[PDB]
Structure 1
Amino acid sequence: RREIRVLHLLEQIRAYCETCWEWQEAHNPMPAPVEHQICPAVCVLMKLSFDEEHRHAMNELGGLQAIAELLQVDCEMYGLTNDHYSITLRRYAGMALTNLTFGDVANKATLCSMKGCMRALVAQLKSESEDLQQVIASVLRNLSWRADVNSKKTLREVGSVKALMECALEVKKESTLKSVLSALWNLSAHCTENKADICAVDGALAFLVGTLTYRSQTNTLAIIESGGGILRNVSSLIATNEDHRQILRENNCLQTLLQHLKSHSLTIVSNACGTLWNLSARNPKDQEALWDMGAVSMLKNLIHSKHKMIAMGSAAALRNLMA
């Protein structure tokens, strides 16, 4: 039976966590995960989380909570270890949390309500393991997509935004950057504080502008779309900040945004329209540059787009130039 199999595995990691918490109570030695064949149990649980029916059995047996607790406790016990076994364990746990959070309202809220785990998740963004960083950003991505108000507050309070922005300036692999930026894309929409935090990170704006012309030799637009989506979101705050505007000017942001108007990707066009909406508002200097770069002609043919953001964004930008 699926259910007995899932129960077995869940009981295994609960009993291990119980051991770990008992050790923690002590201000009698430290338990070891290898000793309890914990990584294999998580591994199977991870594999099974790709299957809908097994996911369902997990949800009936509080699987999410159990896997989250394990991740939390291993993070608290060993910190930012480079040990292969504990990193593996954390990866598999995170992959399973990702699978169980996707599209699941109740699971997302449950995970965010687990404060200690949320703190552990965020701390893992400073792990030297890019694979682990990728997985954690995947969890944060799901938790931040269409979240309820309390979850949005929690995600902000545990320092997700600054940790993700710093992580983005640092990561070496395109695959890691992709999920880091995806999560930032979601989070940057949530509140104005998140936007300020992104803009506050030294070099963040230059970096974001750089993603607009990212040389994706993996033949995708993922980085352009994500980086530019973050930029669109924080652009509303950039608009009110002369120094930040200047950083954009120094990296030819406006010029590039105009070329994104010609992109075949509706996501890209949509992002650029939103960004131009904000940057073309109440700034003679940038309005003037936009006029001189031929923005009007590029924007007028987008006002009838079927995509609401492109239509409104381009129309609003056009009106900002015409006023």
Structure 2
Amino acid sequence: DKDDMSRTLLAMSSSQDSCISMRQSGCLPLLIQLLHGNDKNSRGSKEARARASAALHNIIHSQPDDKRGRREIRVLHLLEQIRAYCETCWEWQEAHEPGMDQDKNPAPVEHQICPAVCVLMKLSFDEEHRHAMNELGGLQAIAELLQVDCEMYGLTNDHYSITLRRYAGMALTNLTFGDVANKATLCSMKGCMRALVAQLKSESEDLQQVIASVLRNLSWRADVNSKKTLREVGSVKALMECALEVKKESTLKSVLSALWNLSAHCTENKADICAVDGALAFLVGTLTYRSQTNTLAIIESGGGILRNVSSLIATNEDHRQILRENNCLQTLLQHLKSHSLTIVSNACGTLWNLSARNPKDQEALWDMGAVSMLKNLIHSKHKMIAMGSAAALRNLMANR
């Protein structure tokens, strides 16, 4: 196979500053492909990857002492420690495998790699470092460390385990932020994705938050393959299920912020939300919950999810009933009196879908006096409210 192209790439790297021309030639992406390549299993053997990272060391270390030349060495050094550690874990997994004679001396202790992943996490907050991690294949390395640990100790409560799970995740947050190509790469890592989604059931609500924002980022401006993957790994259902059980306000904020993105993808995701028991009641419950910090943060995200899923609820009487018995329609009208742009916009969008093709509720809105409230918002400064108002008014005026 292409084991040999790593032999030639290392040989080109060996000579005194001929690796300067290699980066010019664009060998870095080729090196990363041998080391992580999932551009689709384009990553070579262990002996092949040993050569690659070595050649990759030689090329980055054969630069001038520039500012960009010192970030790359600082970063690569850390990534090399992570890569080397991952090699310890993969060797353990192959040795402690079904059919394998488990009677020979190797276990990798997590505590040694946590300081290394800590630094990277902190550094990923800087754009310049992100750019460097990006061309050094940082994202994939950080992600590989995440998945391999979850695979080894599934949902443990060990402090040192949680910590690295939390660090790695926070870096993957920064690295996917605004980066369309990184959101795609991580989503293509199907093994790592399942690991992430699986951590939502962790008892650590600090970690659950570090999973929620990652899935939030991945669901923002996602490509078609990414939206497909996020759907397939059932992240939607997983999030909703952990939201029904989260205690901390911050954790909920994060979780709801992710679902709000995902609820805009497809009617398949909308249905997935509605399928979960008590989810709808929970959402309607959020329509009145005020947070300690950022008062209306949950009302906004809750009403937003509901605003999206309201399109489906309109077809279901049972789901309109769950909505009616948790006092939704009445709450949405009190939302119209709000001073918030987001809150009003959600209520209008929600009432839009709910006011049509159902006399059972559209008479209830009349008896609530919604007409005297919507006419206040037909001449508003934003169409979303204005069109949300008049269309709901049209649905009501049809039934007098």
- The TM-score bracket by the shorter chain reads over 0.9
* Deviation for aligned residue 1:25: 1.9
- 1:281–1:320 Cα contact (<8 Å) kept: yes
Residues 98-141 of structure 1 deviation map (CA, whole Å, 9 limit, x = unaligned): 01111110000111010000000000000110000000001000
5+ unaligned residues in a row in structure 2: which ranges?
Answer: 1-69, 99-105
Distance between the aligned counterparts of 2:167 and 2:77, measured in 1?
17
Distance 1:35 1:230, change over 3 A: closer
3-state SS, counterpart of residue 293 of structure 1: coil
* Deviation for aligned residue 1:314: 1.6
Distance between the aligned counterparts of 2:258 and 2:201, measured in 1?
15
Distance between the aligned counterparts of 2:148 and 2:382, measured in 1?
46
Which structure has the larger Rg? 2
* Deviation for aligned residue 1:197: 1.1
* Deviation for aligned residue 1:220: 1.5
- 2:75–2:120 Cα contact (<8 Å) kept: yes
The structure with the greater share of residues assigned to helix is 1
Q: Could you say which structure has the greater relative contact order, defined with CA pairs below 8 angstroms and 6 or more residues apart?
A: 1
Distance between the aligned counterparts of 1:83 and 1:161, measured in 2?
27
Equivalence map 1:176-255=2 (5 Å): 176-255=251-330
Distance between the aligned counterparts of 1:126 and 1:2, measured in 2?
36
Percent pairwise identity: 100
Distance between the aligned counterparts of 1:271 and 1:12, measured in 2?
48
Distance between the aligned counterparts of 2:211 and 2:351, measured in 1?
32
Distance between the aligned counterparts of 2:397 and 2:117, measured in 1?
60
Distance between the aligned counterparts of 2:96 and 2:205, measured in 1?
33
Distance between the aligned counterparts of 1:208 and 1:47, measured in 2?
34
Distance 1:235 1:163, change over 3 A: same
- 2:89–2:108 Cα contact (<8 Å) kept: no
Distance between the aligned counterparts of 1:33 and 1:157, measured in 2?
32
3-state SS, counterpart of residue 45 of structure 1: helix
5+ unaligned residues in a row in structure 1: which ranges?
Answer: none
* Deviation for aligned residue 1:32: 4.7
- 2:290–2:298 Cα contact (<8 Å) kept: no
* Deviation for aligned residue 1:193: 1.1
Residues 249-306 of structure 1 deviation map (CA, whole Å, 9 limit, x = unaligned): 1111000000101111111111111100011011111111111211112112222323
- 1:196–1:237 Cα contact (<8 Å) kept: yes
- 2:348–2:385 Cα contact (<8 Å) kept: yes
* Deviation for aligned residue 1:307: 2.5
- 2:290–2:297 Cα contact (<8 Å) kept: no
Q: Which runs of 4+ in 1 moved over 3 A?
A: 31-36
- 1:68–1:111 Cα contact (<8 Å) kept: yes
- 1:188–1:233 Cα contact (<8 Å) kept: yes
How many residue pairs get matched?
322
2:173 corresponds in structure 1 to 98
* Deviation for aligned residue 1:23: 1.8
* Deviation for aligned residue 1:28: 9.9
Residues 26-52 of structure 1 deviation map (CA, whole Å, 9 limit, x = unaligned): 3599x7554672000000000001111
* Deviation for aligned residue 1:317: 1.0
Equivalence map 1:1-323=2 (5 Å): 1-26=70-95, 32-34=107-109, 37-323=112-398
Distance between the aligned counterparts of 1:150 and 1:314, measured in 2?
36
* Deviation for aligned residue 1:167: 0.4
Q: What is the CA RMSD across the aligned residues, in angstroms?
A: 1.6
Distance 1:25 1:32, change over 3 A: closer
Distance between the aligned counterparts of 1:223 and 1:15, measured in 2?
42
- 1:16–1:36 Cα contact (<8 Å) kept: no
Residues 201-241 of structure 1 deviation map (CA, whole Å, 9 limit, x = unaligned): 11111110000011323351110001111111111111100
Q: TM-score, normalised by structure 2?
A: 0.78
Larger mean Cα displacement after TM superposition, 141-150 or 308-317? 308-317
- 1:50–1:99 Cα contact (<8 Å) kept: yes
